[PDB]
Every structure is written in C-alpha cells, then in structure tokens.
Amino acid sequence: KEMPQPKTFGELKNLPLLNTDKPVQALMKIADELGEIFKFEAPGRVTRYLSSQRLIKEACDESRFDKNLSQALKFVRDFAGDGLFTSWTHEKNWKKAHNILLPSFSQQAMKGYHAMMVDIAVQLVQKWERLNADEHIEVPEDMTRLTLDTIGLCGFNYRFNSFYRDQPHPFITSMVRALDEAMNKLQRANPDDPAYDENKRQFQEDIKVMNDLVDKIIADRKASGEQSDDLLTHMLNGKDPETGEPLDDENIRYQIITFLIAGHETTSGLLSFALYFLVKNPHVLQKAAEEAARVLVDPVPSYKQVKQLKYVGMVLNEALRLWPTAPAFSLYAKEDTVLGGEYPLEKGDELMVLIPQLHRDKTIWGDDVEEFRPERFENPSAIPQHAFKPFGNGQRACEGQQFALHEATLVLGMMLKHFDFEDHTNYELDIKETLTLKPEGFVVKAKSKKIPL
Numbered sequence: 001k002e003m004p005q006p007k008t009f010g011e012l013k014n015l016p017l018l019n020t021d022k023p024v025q026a027l028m029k030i031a032d033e034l035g036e037i038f039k040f041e042a043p044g045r046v047t048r049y050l051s052s053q054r055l056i057k058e059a060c061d062e063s064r065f066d067k068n069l070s071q072a073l074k075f076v077r078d079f080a081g082d083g084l085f086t087s088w089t090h091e092k093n094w095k096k097a098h099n100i101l102l103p104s105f106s107q108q109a110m111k112g113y114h115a116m117m118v119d120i121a122v123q124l125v126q127k128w129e130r131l132n133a134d135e136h137i138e139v140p141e142d143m144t145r146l147t148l149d150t151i152g153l154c155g156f157n158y159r160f161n162s163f164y165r166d167q168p169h170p171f172i173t174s175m176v177r178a179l180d181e182a183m184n185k186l187q188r189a190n191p192d193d194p195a196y197d198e199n200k201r202q203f204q205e206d207i208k209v210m211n212d213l214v215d216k217i218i219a220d221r222k223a224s225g226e227q228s229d230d231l232l233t234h235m236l237n238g239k240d241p242e243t244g245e246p247l248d249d250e251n252i253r254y255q256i257i258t259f260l261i262a263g264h265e266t267t268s269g270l271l272s273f274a275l276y277f278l279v280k281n282p283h284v285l286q287k288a289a290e291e292a293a294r295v296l297v298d299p300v301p302s303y304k305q306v307k308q309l310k311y312v313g314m315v316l317n318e319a320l321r322l323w324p325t326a327p328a329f330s331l332y333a334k335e336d337t338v339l340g341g342e343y344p345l346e347k348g349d350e351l352m353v354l355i356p357q358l359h360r361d362k363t364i365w366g367d368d369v370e371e372f373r374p375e376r377f378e379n380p381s382a383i384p385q386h387a388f389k390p391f392g393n394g395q396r397a398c399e400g401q402q403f404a405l406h407e408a409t410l411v412l413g414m415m416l417k418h419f420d421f422e423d424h425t426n427y428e429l430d431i432k433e434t435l436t437l438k439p440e441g442f443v444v445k446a447k448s449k450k451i452p453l
C-alpha cells in the first residue's frame, strides 16, 4: 500500500504546513482527512504520522522500534543535555540516570514529596480565597505558577516564589524563552542566517542563566553537606545499581532542568484542560466536587486521601484523552519491517505518534469520542492495550507520571473542595501550542465555600 501525503510546497516539501501558531492542531486536521498514516517531508527529513491504535500498537513494540530524538528534542538538548528526556535509550547516562532516578519517581517516593506539593497547593488556594468579588482567575497562568514552584521545591528545594510576583523569577523567564527558541528553530530553513545571530545571543545567555543558578545550588549543597527531601539530595547520594557510580554534577544539573521543562507545562496544561471540561460539564463538576468534599475531610490533605480521589483521577485521565498535553512522540525502526501488514519501513525510518488522534480512534472508544465522559475510565481493565498513551511508551514512558498525577489530583481535589467555579465569560476553547498544549485566555470566577484551610 501507498501512503497519503498533505500539500507540498516545492523545495520546502510539507514544512510550510506547520508554519502556524497551532501546528499540532494542523496535523490533527490533516489526519482527519488522510487517515491512520500519512507521510510528512521537510528538507532532508521524512516522518510518518500515525493516528490509529491498530498501527500505534505495533509502533509501541520495543523489539521493533525505539524512542527517537526528534528535531524538537535535539534542539531542547542544547539546554537539557543528556538528561533522561533528551537521551538515546542506549546512551550510558540514560541507563545510569534511569536506574538511579527510578525509586525517586515511584509511588512510594510520592509520600516524600507530598508535603512540598501541599505547600504550594495551599498557596494557590489562599491566593484564590483572597480575591475580591470583582476579580477573576487566569487559569493556565496560575496552574503554571503552581507546577513550576512545586517542581522547584521537590526538585532542588528552591523557591521561585511565583505567587509573590508579577514578573517570574529570572530562571523561569530564561527557561520559557529557551523553550520558545527551540520550538521556533523548527521552522527555520536557514538556521545560520545572520538574521538569527541575536536569537543565538539570547539563547546562550538564557542557557547561562539556567546553568549558573542550578550549578550554584548543587555546588553549595555538596560543600555544605546539607540534606533535604528533594530529588537533588537523592541524586547526590545515589549510586547506580549497575555501575556503582553516582551521576556527575553536570548530569545532575541537566536532570534538574529536565524535570522543569518536561513536567511544568504538561502538568499545568492538564489542570487547565480539566478545569475547563469541568465548567463545561456541570454534572461532572458536581460529582467531582462531592467526592472531594467526601474524601478531603481534614484542613489539609494527606497522601492517603489524595489516593482516594478516584473520580478526580478519572476526570484527569479523560482530560488527557482529549487533550494530551505532550501530544506527540517520535520512534525509529530498529530494523527493516512492515507496519500493519501494508507499509514497508527501512531501518532508521521515523514515526510520530499523534496522541490526540489515537485518543479519538472510534474503533476503540466508540461513537462518542468528542464527549467528555470520565466514566470511560471507571474500570482501567477495560481500556485496550496501547489505546491510551498520554505518557508515552514502554521504558521511555514519562518518568514523571506518578508525580504529575499525584500533583494534579491533590490540586484539583483541593480546588473543588474550596470553591464553586463559574464560567463567567462562557469561554471559547482556544488551544495555544508551545512544546505542549494549553487553553489560552481560559478565565473563571471562584466563589469560596469558606472551608478552613
């Protein structure tokens, strides 16, 4: 079989189709037309975009395909280095960091981070409690303050103190601008044109800002010998079960940067989409709110209680089904192979899993894939294998998954315990794309239930 391909533009091939504010949504639109697989060419590059569970279940077979570093990840590596997210599976620092960080991100480790997550969650709730009657909430903006601060504290015991400022801490400003430059480079056919010399200067100084802050904290932590409940203490003390070495200081810095860039935006996007679907579906908001009130009975949520928020958990998964906030991941064929009995691949060929399309596969989910129905997830034993992949695949799946879900469940639970929410502008969904996806301009009003905190 021969595969479909969207509009080409001569020597730029398909590249101009993604010269847009919303390239992932462009790709979904193209998928809707072309089906489960289409070819997409840029100068010197070819990728095949997959949208059906039928084909993605094969792509997720690790004996046949491994994680690929996409152009985006290669660009992000200029500041994320050989951290877990931007490494090849067979790079020695991937294997070593994977072994060392595994118990730091396990469900048990969540008991240790819970107090610091609650610290920032309480800040977010207190902020909302202190709003005057005239005021509203900028939802993604606050969710991002919350996730950055949480990752800062659990990551390296550092307070960005985002709820104390109008202009973010300079580290955050530089990180956001480095990510932006990395995504922007995706569209640059002529990377080295003098027109970009200034982008380069700014990129290098942003990398410098990030490295100086993190390197300094690591160096001071080593000098002082101080110990804390953060990931930095784990990495300073952890010996690889295979090689018996700890991560060196430079890689520790990259893992810290990596937790921030891989975790802050995806998780805040998730909280934002979930709140959106809840105010667009009042029945569901009421069910979630009832559970939160029922379960979070203490002035401050315990680890055990968050684990009891089953329906909030379903709400989060159903938001991830519709708008998985890291919406695409890349794979390469380890050897020549034939995909789906129909599409021959050569060794090294690139595949891109388009998660939002997979999550809309009618042959899996049914007639009602656009509806927000948390009940799909009542019985996780019911979901076909490889049908639901918001956290990627296999040994290269999100290492942050337990952290992200525990933070999102705690926070969404506390929000629904403490406030009634009004969609006062009858907000029209508008999805901004950076490296990740989020609602843009999503605003609400929160009326306090006046429950002690």
Ligand code: HEM
Pocket: 067, 084, 085, 086, 098, 151, 258, 259, 260, 262, 263, 264, 266, 267, 270, 324, 325, 326, 329, 330, 390, 391, 392, 393, 395, 396, 397, 398, 399, 400, 401, 403, 404
């Ligand atoms: C809802 C929130 C999140 C989503 C949807 C998400 C999604 C993903 C996805 C799809 C991947 C696979 C990337 C690929 O195949 O190229 C990934 C990898 C990764 N994520 Fe997450 N992420 C989330 C939150 C977090 C958080 C909070 C952290 C850290 C605290 C984190 C850390 C990582 C790391 C370290 C990797 C690379 C793991 C490895 O390859 O060994 N993520 N994430």
